[PDB]
Ligand SMILES: N=C(N)NC[C@H]1Cc2cc(CN3CCC[C@@H]3CO)ccc2[C@@H]1NC(=O)C(=O)Nc1ccc(Cl)c(F)c1
Ligand SMILES: *[C@@H]1O[C@H](CO)[C@@H](O)[C@H](O)[C@H]1NC(C)=O
Ligand SMILES: *[C@@H]1O[C@H](CO)[C@@H](O)[C@H](O)[C@H]1NC(C)=O
Ligand SMILES: *[C@@H]1O[C@H](CO)[C@@H](O)[C@H](O)[C@H]1NC(C)=O
């Protein structure tokens with residue numbers, strides 16, 4: 001294809017690392033939105049095979065090695081040591097733009113499952129704003145679906161193909177390490193989670209009909225995928241999800257099997273210093289946690305599930321490109 005560029009709304013005076021990187025690598029956004037309609041054009045898309053995702057992945061990796069430097073980095077046999085200062089870290093939206101001679105096509109089917117032919121298409125200079133939010137299991141601070149829940153997969157038969165659940169209805173998750181210096185928790189409205197998993201099981205049933213739907217905690221792996229992991233304000237949170245991906249859906253009803261309390265699920269989390277890298281196969285060691293109350297109040301906007309009568313799904317992730325895919329699913333670059 002071609003090298004795209006990034007337009008951000010970032011601020012040169014911000015110390016925050018996303019802002020620095022973007023002012024150093026992205027052009028300013030166009031306030032005037034260049035957009036063409038053309039319903040009839042009938043392009044095909046395949047979110048699973050989309051050079052845009054690669055380019056963004058590249059960039060985010062660059063941004064992380066520039067901003068979130070680890071005290072140590074073990075890759076292969078080598079151990080590189082850098083200064084690993086604490087930093088101001090809040091992901092900002094990024095727009096991916098097509099350079100002169102190329103344009104981005106945008107699929108407008110509010111229910112597009114991200115592969116195949118798309119009726120209502122548009123021409124755009126740039127993607128919407130996308131926050132590069134690295135995480136497993138739970139997709140955070142993404143952009144909602146429009147009409148109903150969508151279920152995206154390269155191939156649902158193949159149970160080794162990550163499944164992306166695109167929710168239409170954000171679900172609050174609040175994580176705090178309050179003022180063991182490494183212990184924190186996450187709170188979720190069990191009624192909200194309730195509804196969401198029930199609705200998700202419905203939609204999942206449409207794709208496996210004679211089967212009862214099951215949600216079970218992550219079976220095994222590196223700690224970074226068997227828990228909901230993510231970076232908040234700098235530190236690396238790992239949160240246990242077993243009280244969350246824990247329920248059955250049978251006969252149009254969803255029962256939650258995980259344990260709650262006064263109608264909220266709380267997740268035990270630990271802040272980890274040693275970190276299995278998502279960028280490449282290796283480890284990164286970071287300084288002990290900063291002090292004071294570390295809190296991220298985020299929207300669960302999507303899931304990352306893997307499947308194994310009864311059909312049962314567990315939370316997955318680990319290929320940070322799936323996060324990008326979940327937002328970029330609806331575009332392709334052309335010409
Ligand atoms: N150091 C290794 N090994 N990097 C390999 C990556 C690549 C991959 C891929 C799969 C997918 N599976 C299924 C089929 C193929 C593969 C086999 O497992 C799972 C995990 C992983 C690994 N991702 C992570 O390690 C990771 O994301 N850490 C992490 C760190 C910080 C934060 Cl905030 C976070 F959110 C996460
Ligand atoms: C996705 O939708 C296309 C049609 O738009 C269909 O051919 C394909 O089988 C669907 N796959 C999944 C996993 O929904
Ligand atoms: C979201 O999707 C679900 C199931 O796909 C549906 O029941 C609901 O009405 C949709 N819209 C919402 C919840 O606003
Ligand atoms: C998914 O994989 C199965 C084998 O696991 C294969 O038979 C099937 O054709 C694949 N689906 C698609 C849409 O290619």
Ligand SMILES: *[C@@H]1O[C@H](CO)[C@@H](O)[C@H](O)[C@H]1NC(C)=O
Nearest residue numbers: 223226227239240241242243
């Ligand atoms: C999550 O909690 C359950 C029970 O509390 C435990 O068996 C499981 O190993 C925990 N996983 C992690 C990664 O802490």
Ligand SMILES: *[C@@H]1O[C@H](CO)[C@@H](O)[C@H](O)[C@H]1NC(C)=O
Nearest residue numbers: 216217242243246257258259
């Ligand atoms: C669901 O949660 C309960 C306690 O909250 C736990 O005993 C049970 O094992 C969990 N289910 C699974 C499949 O882990």
Ligand SMILES: *[C@@H]1O[C@H](CO)[C@@H](O)[C@H](O)[C@H]1NC(C)=O
Nearest residue numbers: 188189190191192262263264
């Ligand atoms: C949030 O949770 C409380 C109890 O945990 C419940 O009373 C309230 O209705 C929930 N919010 C919504 C919008 O349902």
Ligand SMILES: *[C@@H]1O[C@H](CO)[C@@H](O)[C@H](O)[C@H]1NC(C)=O
Nearest residue numbers: 190191194254255256263264
């Ligand atoms: C929804 O949550 C409420 C309170 O948190 C609980 O009483 C109810 O059993 C839940 N609904 C389902 C279908 O599990």
Ligand SMILES: *[C@@H]1O[C@H](CO)[C@@H](O)[C@H](O)[C@H]1NC(C)=O
Nearest residue numbers: 091133140141296297298299
């Ligand atoms: C999600 O967005 C809110 C608002 O920008 C922010 O407070 C929170 O830290 C974000 N969460 C993550 C994981 O970036």
Ligand SMILES: *[C@@H]1O[C@H](CO)[C@@H](O)[C@H](O)[C@H]1NC(C)=O
Nearest residue numbers: 141144170171172297298299
């Ligand atoms: C969560 O979703 C709401 C509604 O979609 C949105 O207005 C808000 O910016 C999002 N972020 C937080 C932290 O609530």
